[PDB]
């Protein structure tokens, strides 16, 4: 290739063509509350579709402690990638640990790591009328 890395090789016996590719995919991020409160973590594989995560990690040849972070009931799919080790919630809070793409994570309540959509702000509405005004009376 342009990086002087060989990618395709011809078998000297069968004259077929084989593609060699790196056995290390892209980035892995670890989300931790801190090792002063607990010892569980969440794992984010970014730019990886979580349907086929086990192919990208080769979890068959890892430790059994690495297989419980490969699939389960705690699988979430965000625009960043696939997040394993956290529970999805529907309420929105202020951002604590920024995962990305609008998704934040925190350590809520026995405590567990939760992932949610960040809250932009408080919701308010003021009515527009063409013949009324609001004037302060105190300060």
């Amino acid at each position: 290739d342009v990086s002087d890395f060989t990618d395709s090789v011809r078998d000297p016996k069968t004259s077929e063509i084989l593609d060699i590719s790196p056995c290390s995919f892209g980035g892995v991020s670890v989300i931790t509350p801190g090792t002063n409160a607990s010892s569980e973590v969440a794992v984010l594989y970014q730019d990886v579709n979580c349907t086929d995560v086990s192919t990208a990690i080769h979890a068959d040849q890892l430790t059994p402690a690495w297989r419980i972070y490969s699939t389960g009931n705690n699988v979430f799919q965000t625009q960043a990638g696939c997040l394993i080790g956290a529970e999805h919630v529907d309420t929105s809070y202020e951002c604590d640990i920024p995962i990305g793409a609008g998704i934040c994570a925190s350590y809520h309540t026995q405590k567990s790591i939760v992932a949610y959509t960040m809250s932009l702000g408080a919701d308010s509405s003021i009515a527009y009328s063409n013949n009324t005004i609001a004037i302060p009376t105190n300060f």
Binding site: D1, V2, D4, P22, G102, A122, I126, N131, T132
Partner: protein, 327 residues
Amino acid sequence: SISITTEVMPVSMAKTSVDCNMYICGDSTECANLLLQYGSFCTQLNRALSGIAAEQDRNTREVFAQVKQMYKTPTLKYFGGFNFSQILPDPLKPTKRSFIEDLLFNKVTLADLICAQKFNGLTVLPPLLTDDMIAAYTAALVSGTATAGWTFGAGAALQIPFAMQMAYRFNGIGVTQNVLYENQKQIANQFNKAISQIQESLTTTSTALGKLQDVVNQNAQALNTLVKQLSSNFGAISSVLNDILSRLCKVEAEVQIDRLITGRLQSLQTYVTQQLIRAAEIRASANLAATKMSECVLGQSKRVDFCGKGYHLMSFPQAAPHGVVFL
């Protein structure tokens, strides 16, 4: 006459991270052992890149998040003859952006090149705030300006009709209140005409958003230069790390490998230094954008040529790819 002029300012750039061990020694155990002898050099670049990424998120947040409540867009886009429909989201169309923002998002083109970056440890992380969230912020700012005026910046929102707001804004530049009320419809027609001209100018192909494409181009060139520099042998017998280990002995192979290690380390150092300088420039631009949003959207400014050519009346923000556009 009433004139609407546009100003484009960059806010953030792309956040990138580099895996040092897989950039320098790709899947090589011997090169990994020789790399540990260079202690605490790969951990010094990740700290700098993490600082840059956190700075980018801070830039975007502390420019755009300036209101403490979110205002719903009104059902009526006609405030006393002034047509606000082009700069507010359209309920019937299922996009969460205004029309001018839709034009702005098409004039900047964000995109075996990305795959080679991915295979060598170069990764681009997504921004924390998505485009819909920034669109929500700008819609809240425009709605608050149309319905409340200058008061919501300094505290809670105080309702006022739009004509009386324009009367105060004419008082602020030295023209009495009656001049607005005598010929209000002429001013409304000029406002609508200038909005239409801005729309027409943005529609046609131009280079008005050239300052935003140059950020994207420079980051792409830097990352491609890192990918391309891996083919240099740096004075060694070859640039392939697996051919030096196939026909040489340990004492004579370590001497050849160390040259490649030093060359790739100093290439990656050049990249991180250039990124730090460019990040400083982007931070200065974002600080100016934040103070412009504070002093020209939440109020009226008497500084000369700070917010356009003429006497400033009021101003509107719009979102753009990695940037902001002030009208």
